[PDB]
């Protein structure tokens, strides 16, 4: 399978756009956390289907499939948020009917900190002019590199996606030195995704313990693990 065809399969694995079915209206600490958790739950279901559409994922042991998804889910959710927000400076496009402003994160203690982190990283991808195909490769890499017989299968897959990203960059026709520079810049931003991730879950976990947000089966499970 060539890189171009591997990337096509990622495009075909893309989850559908999700809405939370919410009539436009102001946000409160309760209506925000409830919306964010309800959205996370719906997206998690779609994320599972997405992972299964990545060539080779279902070939991994059920134990590996579960471990990869339980550790990277939040990072994958945030990478998607950033790609959707790339063309809307200053805004976090969680979903069409869930567009939040930086000053609205002040309605929730501890979240304005995370929004700033997400908006910063987003602005960075915006500066690099992140392309859709790079986004696809990067998202897949997040899932496959979140690991801390089935083992070599995983390595092979991660290597395949990495080769696909390099290929995407090579098509932009830019300087070879600039292709290496770009590859490193995109990959270095992943540390900032994993950072906003650990912070985002700590915040969510604190929220769960306080029973502030309703009970969401899949999300609760992903959170607990």
């Amino acid at each position: 399978l060539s890189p171009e065809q591997l990337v096509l399969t990622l495009l075909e694995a893309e989850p559908p756009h999700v809405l939370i079915s919410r009539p436009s209206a102001p946000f409160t600490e309760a209506s925000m956390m409830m919306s964010l958790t309800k959205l996370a739950d719906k997206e998690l279901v779609h994320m599972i289907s997405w992972a299964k559409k990545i060539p080779g994922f279902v070939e991994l042991s059920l134990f590996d499939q579960v471990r990869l998804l339980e550790s990277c889910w939040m990072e994958v959710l945030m990478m998607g948020l950033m790609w959707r927000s790339i063309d809307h400076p200053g805004k976090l496009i969680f979903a069409p009917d869930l567009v939040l402003d930086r000053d609205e994160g002040k309605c929730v203690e501890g979240i304005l900190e995370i929004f700033d982190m997400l908006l910063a990283t987003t602005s960075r991808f915006r500066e690099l002019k992140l392309q859709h195909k790079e986004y696809l490769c990067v998202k897949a890499m997040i899932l496959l590199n979140s690991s801390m017989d089935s083992s070599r299968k995983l390595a092979h897959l991660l290597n395949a996606v990495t080769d696909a990203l390099v290929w995407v960059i090579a098509k932009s026709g830019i300087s070879s030195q600039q292709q290496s520079m770009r590859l490193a810049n995109l990959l270095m931003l992943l540390s900032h995704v994993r950072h906003a991730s650990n912070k985002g879950m700590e915040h969510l976990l604190n929220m769960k313990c306080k029973n502030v947000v309703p009970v969401y089966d899949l999300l609760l499970e992903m959170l607990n693990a």
């Binding site: 599972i48 059920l62 499939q65 339980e70 899949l218 693990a225």
Partner: peptide, 9 residues
């Protein structure tokens, strides 16, 4: 939950 979605379509 995560497991049943991984084994069904």
């Amino acid at each position: 939950k995560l497991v049943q979605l991984l084994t069904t379509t």
